RNA sequence: GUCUACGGCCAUACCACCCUGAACGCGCCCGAUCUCGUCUGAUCUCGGAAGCUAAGCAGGGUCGGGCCUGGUUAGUACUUGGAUGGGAGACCGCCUGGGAAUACCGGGUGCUGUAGGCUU
RNA sequence: AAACCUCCCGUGGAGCAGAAGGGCAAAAGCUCGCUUGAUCUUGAUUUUCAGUACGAAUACAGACCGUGAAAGCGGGGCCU
RNA sequence: AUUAGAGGUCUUGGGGCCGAAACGAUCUCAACCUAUUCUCAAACUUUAAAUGGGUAAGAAGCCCGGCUCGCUGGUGUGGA
């Protein structure tokens, strides 16, 4: 045979993770980095902008570290741009940018800073950065929280990063993980971001699967079809939710009902049950013996 | 005779807690030091930068200068019949509040809450600590039972 | 009423042929997993030096190639039509997946040059299920639990009703 | 040969044992610490008897290796071969030192790695014998001839535990009735109602 | 009640196995035109929504291991101060105060902040 | 028995130039990419200490840079 | 570092035994593993004292109000 690893020894000595690494959220080295504040800053908040793209939707998030835990001081989603008029694709490059869109306006509409500092109203894709205006309350400034996302060129969360700096966000970024980079030759051509801004790059793939093969082209795309969003009215279905966005940023919470106060979860077993079960147990398991005796 | 090395009989001093090695929990960090915040100093191994020295692992100084990573203390150090209020650059992560001055802060605020209350009721209400006092005298009650009586038991050898 | 998520596939085929020594031979073995698979094959050199073998510490001495989709699993229709649909019940392992080796490449069919050889390859089948890509996604990285793994037997009687192979003691 | 006994009696430095530091150490004298019928169970023999220190002293490797002899010698010729099982509960793990001369007197005199010797306690177990209850007065004597090869004082003292077991002798019997002692070649393995309820059923079936 | 995003404390939260998961969600999953990256679209990046809770995840279970917290061990071991105390010594007792750790035996099995859902 | 390929277990039982100790797991290890903070310049402080030097080191500040999407990190080597 | 028996399996090996032979059996002997068991550590340690080392026990303290800043900045924000 061969010596067990995992004894009674192993576990004596093993020292877990913290919840969130063991559960794999978090990377502590990076995180280190971020939140913590200079000690001559004295509760001044570092804000950071957390983008985390999932399965089925953008999260966009606002906050600064405390000591009981971070505080959000706005959030934005992608399931609320069916109001501004997006429908569909709620999780492609430009459902990213609006998400970052929204959550700018949002938090300068919180602030009273939405009549100054508007950004790029006139979406182009170039390199911009909005700058403090002297005798007005200082341009609000964060920093990108991309997670455990690889941050390659045209990855989603610079996305929702170029949609917080085009509603006046002071976020310092490089443009170079726009997708428009070309890296053989190290330039930036704003054109071909404004296309997956605007999502013309799947308006095209919608347009290749025409004449190729419409059958695997109403399995790509099913609630495209559902929803009557062909490529020709997507460019101008954005451009009517960025302008839908930028006039009514305010979120107005769900009512909440009271609920019938029911329990889907099984309640822990109390310790006169766990206890009287062996009981029984033993009990079956003679009462069972004497049986074949 | 031993060598001068800084970090010299430091095995256990700096060596982390069973169970308590990798990364640092983050609360260390954030956490604000005002100048005049009474602070004990305790190395710890993980954060090799801004050290402490190992003599002064276990005393308990007052800021007196805050930097971006660090603080500046002002510790006694007794040096050979005279104490010398010395002056340390240690890095956030070898810091804790002390708690042994809350304990006064506290103190004062029902000092000086039961000072404006009481005084337009009157009651002169004693403020100082005083030691623990001789106690009173009291009875002692023994109904039903009678006190049972101890004998020492007899001698068994163990081994 | 079996779940429709619970359907053993195919993740990886896994062929290497170990020529155990640097240059042409080598090289050469290089271009048949090329034509056969499609794809440029990867080498692999030696972890350490030993004597008795000939090689040498960071010397070239193999080169391997990794299949997924449907042309992996037209490679092992090719494989185990060498081996008539037999294999041994020592040749799947207790993990759920099991392998096999060639004697020559060119009995796949593969049409022989005498620029470039004959190779010995080997086989390894790496059985799969929807939803072993858990344990190796960056994020929420997680095993997968004992009801969802792939024992020996349940990989062997998969091999049965796939080719209808035999499996022969011995 | 080596120095007498009196050289080497009291516990006067820090433990020393053979180590990576302390290479060298010739091996100890004694090396065989059961004889008799080591291979027996644990309702054949259940008288104990100790022999006990009283001094907080050193015994030497050579006086356990005598004293075992002496003892085995003596149960021999009394409960036969197989009769008892002897069981010498101390390892000699100090080493001590010697600075050998041949002139250099006492500059860096440290020694060199003499022997090897037992750092006895007071009130510890030094040697245990256990056999038939019947051969009660023939292990007293077996243990009173071996305090001769010993330094300072010892008691002889009959356990009240059974055997070389940890329980004793008037509760031993029905614990293996009930079931919280199962028989294990030499000792006995005592079973808690903490374990996995199906390892109770492996027993009571 | 419960989940998601970001957390604080960092096993009462871990590990093994088993059971059950409404709704939302998280996922698995479907693809490779574009972005991006691989020997391989497996990972990574990107575009999706046919299928599924099988797995992850959540909850519960185990005379479970571990961990946490007690009892016991034990006023024991050790120890501050004291004696023209004992003993040939080794060492020990007393006075004055302080006072542990296994084995063995119990109980416990994550709390919680901000923001947003679902059970309308 | 050891060449290479694959899966599984794996709290570090490896590695981090060297003695030993400490420290370290999406790293301080390994592999790549780009680099020269191993640069220029004031003081303060720590260590040995007489509380003198040298050495070594820690916090800053002013420059010039590197790297990274960025927060940042870096004025030699994880620390002794 | 270290004593002893138990229960395991060919996980392998040592002379074999009926086996041409066969993890098939056979008694084995060993290592190996799982539970226990005896004995220890100045250069080992999960635990862990007594004695001991800091600091605090106010007027240089608390509590309001207002100015200054080129520092710090969503924000007469933060700090001084």
Redesign the pocket.
């Known amino acids: ?8 020894a ?22 280190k ?3 913590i504040q ?11 902008m ?1 983008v ?6 953008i ?1 966009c ?1 606002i ?1 600064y ?11 934005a ?1 992608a ?1 609320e741009l069916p109001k501004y008029g997006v429908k ?2 709620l ?6 940018y609006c998400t970052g869109l929204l959550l700018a306006r949002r938090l300068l509409n919180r ?3 939405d009549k100054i500092y508007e950004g790029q109203v006139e979406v182009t894709g170039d390199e911009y950065n909005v700058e ?1 205006i002297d005798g ?6 964060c ?17 929702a ?1 170029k949609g917080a700096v085009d509603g006046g966000l002071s ?4 443009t ?2 726009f ?5 053989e030759s190290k330039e930036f051509n704003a054109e ?1 971001h404004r ?2 801004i605007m ?1 013309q ?2 308006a ?2 919608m347009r ?1 699967l025409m004449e190729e093969d419409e059958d ?1 082209y109403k ?8 929803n009557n969003v062909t490529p020709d009215m997507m460019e101008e279905m954005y451009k009517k939710a960025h302008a839908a966005i930028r006039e009514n940023p305010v ?1 107005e ?19 006169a ?3 009287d ?2 009981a029984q ?2 009990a079956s398991f003679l009462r069972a013996q004497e049986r074949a005796a | 005779t031993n060598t ?5 009989g ?3 001093m ?10 640092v ?4 960090y ?1 956490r ?1 030091y ?3 915040d ?1 602070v ?1 100093i305790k190395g710890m ?9 190992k ?2 692992h ?5 800021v007196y ?8 203390i002002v ?6 019949g ?3 209020a ?6 956030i992560e070898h810091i804790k509040h ?1 708690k ?2 809350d ?3 506290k ?3 029902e ?2 809450q039961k000072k404006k209350e009481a005084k337009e009721k009157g009651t002169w209400v004693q ?1 100082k ?1 005083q030691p623990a006092p001789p106690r009173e005298a009291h009875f002692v009650r023994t109904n039903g039972k009678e006190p049972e009586l101890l004998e020492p038991i007899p001698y068994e050898f163990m081994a | 009423k079996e ?4 359907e053993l596939r195919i ?2 085929l ?3 042929i ?1 020529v ?2 640097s240059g042409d031979r080598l090289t050469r073995a290089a271009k048949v997993l090329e034509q056969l ?1 499609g ?4 080498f ?5 030096t ?1 004597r ?4 040498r510490r960071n010397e070239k ?9 449907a ?1 992996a699993e037209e490679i092992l229709e090719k494989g185990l039509k060498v081996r008539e649909y037999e294999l041994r019940k020592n040749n799947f ?1 207790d ?3 099991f ?1 096999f080796g060639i004697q020559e490449h060119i009995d796949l069919g593969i049409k022989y040059d005498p620029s470039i050889g004959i190779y010995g390859l ?1 086989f ?1 089948v ?1 059985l799969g ?21 792939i024992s020996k037997e349940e990989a062997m009687r998969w091999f049965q009703q796939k080719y209808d192979g035999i499996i022969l003691p011995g | 040969g080596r120095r007498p006994a009196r050289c080497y ?3 006067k ?10 290479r060298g150490v010739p091996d100890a004298k004694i ?4 004889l008799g019928r ?3 169970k644990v309702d054949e023999f259940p008288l104990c008897g100790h022999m006990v220190s ?4 050193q015994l030497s490797s050579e006086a356990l290796e005598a004293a075992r002899i002496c003892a085995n010698k003596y149960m021999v010729k009394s409960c036969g071969k197989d009769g008892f099982h002897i ?5 000699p ?2 080493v001590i030192r010697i600075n050998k001369m041949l002139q250099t007197g006492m500059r860096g005199a440290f020694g060199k790695p003499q022997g090897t010797v ?5 009130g ?2 030094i040697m245990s014998i256990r056999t038939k209850l019947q051969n009660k007065e023939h292990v007293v004597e077996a243990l009173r001839r071996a305090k001769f090869k010993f330094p ?2 010892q008691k002889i003292h009959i356990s009240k535990k059974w055997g ?1 077991t ?1 329980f004793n002798a008037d509760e031993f019997e029905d614990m293996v009735a009930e079931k919280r002692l199962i028989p ?17 059923r492996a027993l009571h079936s």
């Open positions: 045979f061969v010596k067990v690893v995992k004894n009674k192993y576990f004596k000595r093993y020292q877990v993770k913290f919840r969130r690494r063991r559960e794999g959220k978090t990377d502590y080295y990076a995180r980095r971020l939140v200079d000690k001559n800053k004295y509760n001044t908040p570092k804000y950071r957390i985390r793209v999932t399965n089925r939707d999260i998030q906050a570290a405390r000591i009981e835990g971070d505080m959000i001081v706005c959030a989603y399931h569909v694709g999780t492609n490059y430009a459902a990213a602030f009273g800073m403090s007005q309350p200082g341009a609000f400034t920093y990108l929280d991309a997670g455990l996302a690889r941050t390659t060129t045209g990855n989603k969360v610079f996305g990063l976020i310092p970024h490089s170079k993980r997708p428009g980079y070309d890296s071909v296309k997956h999502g790059n799947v095209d793939y290749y695997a399995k790509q795309f099913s609630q495209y079809i559902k979120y919470k769900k009512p909440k009902r009271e609920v019938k106060k029911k329990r889907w979860n099984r309640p822990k077993m109390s310790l049950q766990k206890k079960r062996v147990k033993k | 001068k090395g800084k970090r010299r430091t095995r256990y700096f060596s982390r807690p069973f169970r308590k090695h990798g990364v929990p983050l609360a260390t954030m604000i005002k100048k005049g009474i004990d191994g993980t954060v090799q930068k801004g050290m402490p020295h003599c002064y276990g005393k308990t100084g007052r200068n805050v930097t971006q990573h660090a603080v500046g510790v006694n150090k007794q040096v050979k005279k104490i010398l010395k002056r340390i650059n240690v890095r002390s042994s001055r304990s006064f802060l103190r004062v605020k000092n000086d403020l600590r | 779940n429709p998520m619970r993740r990886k896994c062929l290497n170990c155990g020594e698979t794809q440029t094959p990867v692999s050199k030696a972890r350490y030993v008795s073998f000939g090689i001495i193999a080169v391997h190639c990794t299949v997924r989709g042309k392992s993990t759920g997946n392998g080997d390894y790496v299920r929807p939803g072993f890509s858990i344990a190796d996604k960056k994020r929420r990285t997680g095993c997968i639990g004992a009801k969802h793994r | 009696r009291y516990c430095n820090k433990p020393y044992p053979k180590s990576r530091f302390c090396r065989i610490f059961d080591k291979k027996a009283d001094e907080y002293e069981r010498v509960r101390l390892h793990f100090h037992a750092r006895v306690h007071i510890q177990v300072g004082r070389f940890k294990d070649g030499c000792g006995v393995k005592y079973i808690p109602n903490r374990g996995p309820l199906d390892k109770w």
